[PDB]
Symmetry: D2
Subunit: 387 residues, 4 copies
């Protein structure tokens, strides 16, 4: 079972299945993929769409003539397959000119170039039908404390995002921005290192409604944080515009394993949350097939991403549908959590003797939360050991 | 040298020097301190003031008569010494009734009790002259994924803080709230786990101007984050109302070492930032004298907190005053970071051929940032090896 | 299904189901359990046996008369139920006298007391039938660099273990020692912090054959290490005398969650390894029912430990029995890993032109390892989605 | 002051100052350095010697004729400068053929090639005067649990090191091996991940006397471990053959910052330990000048490594020479830690009533350890604030 179809909204970056396997300590183990081939292979696997950095699709430094040629080839493949392009992004991290950042480089001329490079790819993204434009500021940061005045850097980051918002507004584009946080790597510390920091920063931009977050499973886990909790906070704020699914084993370098690998229980609770909240954006995989693999392993790893999502969706749905779990949720008072604490108001609460003066603290304290029985029912459903 | 005086604004919680040394694996190693003794001993060391949880000062469950007696004794000590009380907080974590939280407990009656307990201590805090009321939601969280619906929990957290804001507003109190984040411990994950998450949450409250953050050095470091960077972002947003200084060696249990211990370079860059930004709130120490120590070691550890701040202040001031460092800052273009990227505007930037069409990317890329020479000058100043 | 019976060799510490819920920030949430009740409740759940610290069974400071009374009660419960006692240990961490360690306290008189306290419990352990005596040196360590000369401390640690080996040898006891590592908590750093460090230390003792390791799942994961890999190395060295099973979510305070919780895939690979290696010692649970729970939750959490082991055993057995997985193992050359590299010898290897001079490095490099397909078959078996 | 000279025994890998700045997300920012230039520039800075991987000095796949040419050029530079070559190593990680390991690749032909490549460089290393041959098994490991049978892999690792020991023994070379641990990166988990694991493994080799450890500051810190403690254990076992000095900020990707950067207090305690133990091997820097830097920054970063060692040496010497610190060491009973616990023997200890029956546990427990005052004296000396 568990066969993916375009309705499941699975998407992949060109840079994922196309990663050649160069890491900090070793050369490439796979040949370069033609983006046209990736589109066609991904359509056959059941993918909904692909995403791209500008430099994935058009080699850096291409003339206007070579650029048009690369885009026409790619567009021809999309038209042939029905594959969509729901998101695009800029590469502001690979070329040595960005070694101190794009939007927050100390050199002003680099920051201006960073903005012009980004604006050019927004035009292309809109033409191809992208609804979300992601920014991962992988070089915005520092290895040493004196290298970056962070208040000034946040001024420059705000300036850049405000100029991008003025640009899409003046052009009448119907595209929104999503900031992708990462705590570190390749810089010693990266600015806006978590979902929370990015959410707070958005609230100081001139047009906050145009901006949300693109959280990545492995990135929040690189700070030891609870990724489903962070996603819940983004949904609560109305800012989950896009999401990057993959796996990560704890606090270390960014692994970008296939989704389902790494923290399996966190993946179950994430899928439970996305599906119960009715998230309807792309389920995008930002993963790297390990460099141990040949090209057959690349496609097996990509298929595995989708398969694991579909298995977890089924288990989470069965968990929530189980009357025994519904009873367990009531026994742990999850339903009381949904009731207002004091809809009767501040005055009524102050004069309520049963909330303080006459509150029986020892009886309340003796009540068990029954959380372990609930969690073991969740474990049983995840493992298919109910029945 | 480095003798502290009240003008340095050093403050200590009653619960810091008063920690009896009970940890998860062992009994208390020190006798309980009388809060009156702590006030007098801290005044002799040069402290500006003390802070308190309600339960530090008034034993839980005290009658109105015993309560008034504990407060009069404490007030008499403050009047005798001139010690100030700039901040207070609620204990919503020790008593078993709070085992699933205060503001976000699943049980509604517990949430109501949590609010009444907090409101009662706000009245006392204002009477004693506190300007900041801190909330550390140490029990708000979960060990397992199904125990807490996080969107509902954030609704209840918002409800509680909005009711506290309505209360201080209706009473005409001149006190502000500061949320203290912590990523984990004693819960498996705590809600609002970092400075960023707390800053983002404040922006959804009804009266955001009343609320800021109380970041703690060790807590951000428990997520492997850069504490000076996080403080810079709080200052940039106008939300650094208070701060907890201590030390922490990496990602593990919350150590609350004396300030200066743990990550020494991060402490240098923090002091550099607080002093150059002109932060003027209390320099509050939330630390625990290790349970290896007797009472002489408690006071030596407390004196060490203040001493290390004063030494780092001197080194950071000398670093910024050094003409050789000023030259190094220009060589790394820290001054260009302060210039707007495009004050000429979006249209001018789009038509500027030198920002893209004619931008010499290879010349820009070849420029060294000279960050290592700058950082070694910082190291030399920290270690007193200049000259 | 998945009902435990005594043949599954599941054991529990008295201190596990008996944890009253006191953590660093809160009071106890459960009443104390009578060890006799724990024996009887654990026998009803299907447990094989119980383990104990001296101070769990005999309150500290008991006279010879009260001591004999506590032991007779406990012995009567064991005889009534058939429950076994396969392991015992000393509490050298709770009482304030041990605040700087037992075997490596700076104070010599404390080290002597630590040895006499331990020797007394070895006598009792042997009388009750224990085959393994565990030592967890939770207080051996330091918060600051100058407090402990670590070479001298390792001398004292070696001295203590050598004296214990001389004692059991002179008494003719048939009991072996197992060192339990932990990287930190309650000390800032603990000596012998991982399985590897403990294995290396054993090799410098006078009688290494008497000593092995008692690794704990969560403890190695507190250093971000791969617990199955560490267990493999202990088995390879012949030193896995005992094991502590529980769960842990990443690098933070020691959670001691029920087994199966935390890193679920690591638990699958651990059970796969223990069962395929034919480990035949106790499957011991060192876990804490969360303090949110009442007494019903305590027993549900304990039952969950055993249930999760039995489910994972079934899935791992089905994984290894699957002919499709056996084919995948050959495709990834797991079988070639078992062949000697050069049983033909050093001289033959030096003169083998096909190992270097004529080795086709590009053909070898192009071979895929097929690891992702293998790992997805493992995922399918863990989740019960094969068929 | 703090000028390095050859007597300080500072050494650098060719791959350190020669790192071109390629990281997982970006291209090279510096041109390649000619090894002859690196020798001459390092001699001018005051370095004692250089180290190399085979592939740093001889491009992979070179004929016997090109190989001899590269070696003669390098040898001519050494003879011209007096620079020594105290250590060499093999590159078994960069070429795609090693994507699953060298000594523990699943493919047997790769393991044989790995051994022949290593043996060839041992011959060259001895000819140039190296006394230590390092092995960093950076590709020995796995991203997924089924890919590697770790017991079989340790068999193959033991086989390889035993064959290398047979080879140097049969040739009569006076060179010893040092294993360099790393917990992860570039593999998801690396075999022998810490100093402890490597020390334990050495004890199972046929000729353990030929093998020790080459611990790296940042690598142990990637597991959150205390690097000075681990070095103490290696010295206690007689196995510290070599050491890699650099800096690392906590648990994340391997940063290889210049020595002194990262955890500054840990660097102070390390230098204190190396100097008080009389370690006399090379002080080798395995660091990467950040890719933000041009070639002037490369040499400033390299000079900074040596400068920071010399400053910390001076501060640690002054700390130990201070009569006030000696008094503090006695007050914390560091001297009692050096006394045997029970040189009177097991029988005397058993019959000593003052060690148990008459031991006054409450008086002992009340003694303060005075560790905080000692640590603040250490802080004062590190910062040059004594006097
Ligand atoms: Co990633
Ligand atoms: Co804290
Ligand atoms: Co534990
Ligand atoms: Co390194
Ligand atoms: Mg991503
Ligand atoms: Mg605090
Ligand atoms: Mg244990
Ligand atoms: Mg190294």
């Amino acid at each position: 079972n568990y066969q993916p179809t375009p309705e499941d909204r699975f998407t992949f970056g060109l840079w994922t299945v196309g990663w050649q396997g160069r890491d900090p300590f070793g050369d490439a183990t796979r040949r370069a993929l033609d983006p046209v081939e990736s589109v066609r292979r991904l359509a056959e696997l059941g993918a909904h769409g692909v995403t791209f950095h500008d430099d994935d699709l058009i080699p850096f430094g291409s003339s206007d003539s070579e650029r048009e040629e690369h885009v026409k080839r790619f567009r021809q493949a999309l038209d042939d397959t029905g594959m969509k392009v729901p998101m695009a992004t800029t590469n502001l991290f690979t070329h040595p000119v960005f070694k101190d950042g794009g939007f927050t480089a100390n050199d002003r001329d680099v920051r201006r170039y960073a903005l012009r490079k980004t604006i050019r790819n927004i035009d292309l993204a809109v033409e191809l039908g992208a609804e979300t434009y992601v920014a991962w500021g992988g070089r915005e940061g520092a290895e040493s404390g004196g290298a970056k005045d962070v208040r000034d850097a946040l001024d420059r980051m705000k300036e850049a995002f405000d100029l991008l918002g003025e640009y899409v507004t003046s052009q009448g584009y119907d595209i929104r921005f999503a900031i992708e946080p990462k705590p570190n790597e390749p810089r010693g510390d990266i600015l806006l290192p978590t979902v929370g920091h990015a959410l707070a920063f958005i609230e100081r931009l001139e047009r906050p409604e145009l901006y949300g977050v693109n959280p990545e499973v492995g990135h929040e886990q690189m700070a030891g944080l609870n990724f489903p909790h962070g996603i819940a906070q983004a949904l609560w704020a109305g800012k989950l515009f896009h999401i990057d699914l993959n796996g990560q084993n704890g606090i270390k370098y960014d692994q970008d394993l296939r989704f389902g690998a790494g923290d399996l229980r966190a993946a179950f609770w994430l899928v439970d949350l996305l599906e119960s909240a009715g998230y309807s954006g792309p389920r995008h995989f930002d993963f790297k097939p390990p460099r141990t693999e040949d090209f057959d392993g690349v496609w097996a790893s990509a298929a595995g991403c989708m398969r694991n999502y579909l298995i977890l969706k089924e288990r989470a749905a069965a968990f929530r549908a189980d009357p025994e779990v519904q009873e367990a949720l009531r026994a742990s008072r999850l339903d009381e959590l949904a009731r207002p604490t004091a809809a009767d108001g501040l005055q009524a609460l102050l004069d309520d003797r049963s909330a303080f003066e006459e509150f029986d603290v020892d009886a309340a304290a003796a009540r068990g939360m029954a959380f372990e029985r609930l969690d073991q029912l969740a474990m049983d459903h995840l493992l298919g050991a109910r029945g």
